[PDB]
Amino acid sequence: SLPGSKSITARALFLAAAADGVTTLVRPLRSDDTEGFAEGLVRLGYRVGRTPDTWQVDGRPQGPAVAEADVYCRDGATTARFLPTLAAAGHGTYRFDASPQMRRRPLLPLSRALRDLGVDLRHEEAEGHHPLTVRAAGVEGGEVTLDAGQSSQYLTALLLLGPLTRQGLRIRVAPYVEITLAMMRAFGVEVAREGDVFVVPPGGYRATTYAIEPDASTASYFFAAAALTPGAEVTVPGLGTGALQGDLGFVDVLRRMGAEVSVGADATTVRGTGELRGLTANMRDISDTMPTLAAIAPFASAPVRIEDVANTRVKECDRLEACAENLRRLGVRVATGPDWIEIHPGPATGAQVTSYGDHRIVMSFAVTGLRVPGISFDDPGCVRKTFPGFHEAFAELRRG
Ligand SMILES: [K+]
Numbered sequence: 001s002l003p004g005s006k007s008i009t010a011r012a013l014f015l016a017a018a019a020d021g022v023t024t025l026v027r028p029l030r031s032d033d034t035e036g037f038a039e040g041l042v043r044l045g046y047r048v049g050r051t052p053d054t055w056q057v058d059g060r061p062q063g064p065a066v067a068e069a070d071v072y073c074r075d076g077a078t079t080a081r082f083l084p085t086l087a088a089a090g091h092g093t094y095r096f097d098a099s100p101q102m103r104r105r106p107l108l109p110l111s112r113a114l115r116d117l118g119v120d121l122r123h124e125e126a127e128g129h130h131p132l133t134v135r136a137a138g139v140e141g142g143e144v145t146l147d148a149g150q151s152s153q154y155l156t157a158l159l160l161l162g163p164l165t166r167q168g169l170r171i172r173v174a175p176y177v178e179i180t181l182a183m184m185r186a187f188g189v190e191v192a193r194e195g196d197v198f199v200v201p202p203g204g205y206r207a208t209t210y211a212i213e214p215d216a217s218t219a220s221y222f223f224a225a226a227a228l229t230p231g232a233e234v235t236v237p238g239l240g241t242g243a244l245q246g247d248l249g250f251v252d253v254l255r256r257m258g259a260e261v262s263v264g265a266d267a268t269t270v271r272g273t274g275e276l277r278g279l280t281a282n283m284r285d286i287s288d289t290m291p292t293l294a295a296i297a298p299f300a301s302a303p304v305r306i307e308d309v310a311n312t313r314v315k316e317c318d319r320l321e322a323c324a325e326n327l328r329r330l331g332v333r334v335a336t337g338p339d340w341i342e343i344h345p346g347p348a349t350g351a352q353v354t355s356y357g358d359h360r361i362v363m364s365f366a367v368t369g370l371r372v373p374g375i376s377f378d379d380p381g382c383v384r385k386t387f388p389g390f391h392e393a394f395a396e397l398r399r400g
Contacts, residue, residue, distance in 0.1 A: 002214040002215065002218055002219055002222065002236055002393070003029050003214065003215060003218065003387065003389075004027050004028050004029035004212040004213065004214055004215065004238075005029065005212060005213050005214065005215045005216070005245065006029050006031065006033070006034075006078075006215070006386075007176070007179070008179065008183070008212050008213055008244065008245075009025075009028045009029040009034055009212050010033075010034070010037070010078035010082065011156065011160065011179070011180060011183050012025050012028065012183065012210055012212055013025070013028070013034065013037050013038070013041075013055075013057070013078075013082070014082045014085075014086060014160050015160065015183060015184070015187045015205055015210070016055070016057035016059065016207070016210070017041055017046055017057055017059060017060065017086055018059060018060070018061065018086060018089075018160070018163075018164055018204070018205055019059035019061070019187055019188075019204070019205035019206060019207040019208075020059055020061050020204055020205065020206060020207060021059055021206065021207025021208075022056060022057070022058050022059070022207055023056070023057050023059055023187075023207040023208060023209070023210060024054055024055070024056055024208075024209040024210070025054060025055045025056075025057070025210055025211075025212060026053065026054050026209065026210070026211040026212060027053060027054075027211060027212050027214070027238060028054075028055050028212045029212065031076075032074060032075060032076060033074075033075070033076030033077065033078050033079055034076070034078070036072075036073060036074035036075070036076045036079045037076060037078060037079045037082070037083065038050070038055070039072075039074075040071050040072070040073065040079055040083045041057070041083075043066075043069055043070075043071050043072075044064035044065065044066060044069055044071065044083070044086075044087065044094070045060075045064050045065025045066040045069075046058060046060055046064070046065065059205070059207050060090070061164070061204045061205075062089075062090060062091065062138075063086060063087060063089050063090015063091060063092070063136065063138075063164075064086070064087055064090045064092055064094065064136075066092060067091075067092045067093070068092055068093045068094070069092070069093075069094055069095070070095045070097070071083060071087075071094060071095070071096050071097075072097055072098070073096060073097065073098040073099075073102065073130065074098065074099055074102070075098070075099045075101060075102050076102070077102070077105060077153070078153070080096075080098050080102055080105070080107065080130060081107050081110055081153055081154070081157055082157060082160070083096065084096055084107075084110075084111075084114075084121070084132065084134055085110070085114070085157045085158075085160070085161050086164075087134050087136050088114050088119045088121065088134050088136050088139060088161070089136070089138060089139050089161060089164035089165065090136050090138070091136055091137055091138060092136055093133070093134075093135050093136070094133070094134045094136060095131065095133050096130055096131060096132050096133070096134070097130050097131040098130040098131075102130065103125075103129055103130050103131070104129075105129075106126070106127075106128030106129045107128060107129075107154070108127060108128030109146060109147050109148040109151075109154040110148075110153075110154040110157055110158070111123065111127075111128060111132065112147070113144050113145075113146050113154070113158055114139075116144050116145070117139050117140070117141070117142075117144055117165075118139065118140055119134065119136065119139060120134070120135040120136075120137070121133070121134050121135075122135075138165075138166060139161065139164065139165040139166070140165065140166050140167055141162075141165030141166050141167030141168050141169050141202060142167055142168075142169070142170065143169075143170045143172065144158065144169060144170070144171055144172070145171075145172040145173075146158055146171055146172065146173050148173070149173075152174065152176040152177070155171070155173060155177060155180075155198075156176065156177070156180045158171050159171065159177070159180050159181070159184065159191065159198060159200060160180070160184070162189075162191070162198075162200025162201070162202075163184075163189050163200060163201065163202060163203055163204050163205055164204065165202055166202060167202055168199070168200050168201045168202040169198070169199075169200045170197050170198070170199055170200075171197065171198040171200065172196055172197050173196055173197075173198070175246055175285075178244075179244045179245070182244050183210075183244070184205075186208060186210060187205040187206055187207070187208060187210070188205055188206030188208075189201065189203075189205060211238055212238070213238050213239055213243055213244060213245055214236055214237075214238050214239055215245075215386070215387070216239055216243065216245035216246075216247040216248045216250075217245070217247045217288045217289065217360075217386070218363075218386060218387050218390075219236045219239060219247075219248070219268075220247060220250045220288075220289045220292040221292055221363045221364065221366065221367055221394070222234050222236065222393075222394075222397060223236070223250065223251055223254060223268075223270045224250075224254065224292050224293075224295070224296050224367050225367050225370055225394075225397055226259070226270040226271060226272050227254040227257065227259035227270055227272050227276065227296065228272060228276065228296050228299060228367065228370060228371065229272040229370065230272045230273060230274035231271070231272060231274075232271065232272045233269060233270070233271045233272075234269070234270050234397070235267055235268065235269040235270075236267065236268050237266065237267040238266070238267065239263075239267065239268045240263060240264050240265050240266045240267055240268060241263050241264070241265055242265070246285055246286055247286050247288055247289050248263075248268065249285070249286045250286055250289040250292060250293075251263065251268060251270055253279075253281050253283075253286075253289075253293060254270055256277075256279055256281070257275070257276050257277050257278075257279060257300065258273055258275030258276060258277045259271065259272060259273060259275075259276075260272075260273055275301075276296065276299050276300050276301060277300065277301045277302065278297075278300040278301050278302025278303050278304050278345065279300075279302075279304060279305075280304075280305040280306075280307060281293065281304070281305070281306055281307070282307050282308045283306050283307070283308065283309050284308040284309065284311070287309050287311050287312050288360060290306055290309050290312050290319065290320075290323070290341075291312075291319055291322075291323050291360045291361060291363075291364035292360075292363075292364050292367070293306060294306065294323040294327065294341065294343060294364065295323075295327075295364035295365050295367050295368045296367060296368070297327075297332075297343035297345060298327065298330065298332045298343065298345050298346065298348045298368065298372075299345060299371060300343075300345045301345070302345070303342055303343065303344050303345070304342070304343045304345070305340060305341070305342040305343075306340060306341050306342075306343075307339070307340045308339060308340070309339055309340065309341070310338065310339035313339075315358070316356075316357070316358065317356035317357065317358045317361070319358065319360065319361070320336060320341050321336070322354070322355075322356050322358060322361050323341060323361070323364075324336050324341055325354060326353050326354060326361065326365060327343060329351045329352075329353075329354075330348040330349060330350070330351055330368070330372065330375075331346070331347060331348050331349045332344065332345070332346060332348055333346065348368070348371075348372045349372070349374075350369075350372050350373050350374025350375045350376075351374070351375065351376075352375075352376045352377065352378055353365045353375060353376065353377045353378065354378055355377055355378055355379040355380075355382055357379055357382045358382065359382050359383045359384075359385040359386050359387070359390075362377050362379070362380060362382055362383050363383055363387070363390060363394075365377070366390075366391075366394055370398065
């Protein structure tokens with residue numbers, strides 16, 4: 001059972017808190033950040049009930065119940081940005097703080113936008129940082145110009161705030177934004193975009209039962225393992241035809257290679273057929289899964305050419321070069337260009353993978369290790385960047 005998407009869980013917790021009615025979140029990610037979010041909601045006077053499978057939140061359209069509170073945001077970036085936003089739309093006096101390490105991560109574009117919008121927010125130490133104090137009296141709404149051309153969480157916080165304002169928002173400023181808008185639609189709000197302005201209406205949200213998708217990028221490694229293994233089947237419940245995450249599109253590549261791929265309404269099944277046919281794939285819009293394909297290409301029937309992936313070179317490591325370097329260490333011939341990589345299938349020999357600290361390099365070449373004995377990693381712990389239990393889950397897949 002693969003973990004829920006962190007960024008989808010974060011947005012869903014905000015929506016569950018802010019909506020009119022009782023929202024049920026199905027399979028949310030349980031992390032230290034989401035645990036602190038839930039704890040902060042309870043401190044603010046929201047009712048939060050939980051089982052191992054579902055969280056239940058009584059929405060508060062007018063914000064926190066308590067008139068005053070001290071809220072500790074722990075180490076969680078979502079908690080540190082979304083809870084002050086929720087509180088700012090309510091009515092009371094709220095003193096926020098974070099761990100000494102999280103205090104070092106400011107949120108100035110968001111706090112500047114809230115103050116532009118009339119919120120009495122005060123930074124107690126440096127501008128932009130926790131600790132900060134919100135003397136909340138709702139948000140009127142209207143125009144605001146956000147200067148967040150970097151982190152995506154600030155625009156998403158303002159979008160999520162919009163329906164809690166009295167007049168709506170006109171926010172003047174990416175896959176991340178389309179996911180936020182689709183989730184707001186599931187909670188009953190349509191957002192319109194006019195040029196550089198997002199036009200968000202007032203009137204609040206409608207509570208619902210909302211299932212959190214498993215991380216689809218994490219799912220790509222388990223789908224690939226099945227496509228590589230004749231007769232093996234992997235199903236991921238919660239990734240279906242209406243899925244918000246673009247990286248589910250990786251399975252359409254696996255189908256083109258000859259795997260049996262069934263994308264159902266509520267689940268996706270990949271079954272290996274023994275046929276793994278070479279192809280050219282434009283992976284511009286699913287580029288986080290480019291390494292997943294590079295790592296099974298040694299076993300294809302013909303060259304695998306991955307095109308339009310300039311974006312993979314400018315991650316924290318050049319993932320195009322890292323894939324080529326590791327494939328060559330395994331004995332595989334590889335050619336590269338400015339924005340493409342071409343992998344020529346043939347026998348491979350185990351070696352230590354140079355990860356560059358990149359979680360996707362480790363997870364991708366783990367799949368290669370199903371068929372090539374003696375693959376190890378210089379940095380196996382870097383998978384914790386997105387999936388702390390990856391090595392356990394993949395070991396379980398191997399045994400099955
Ligand atoms: K103002």
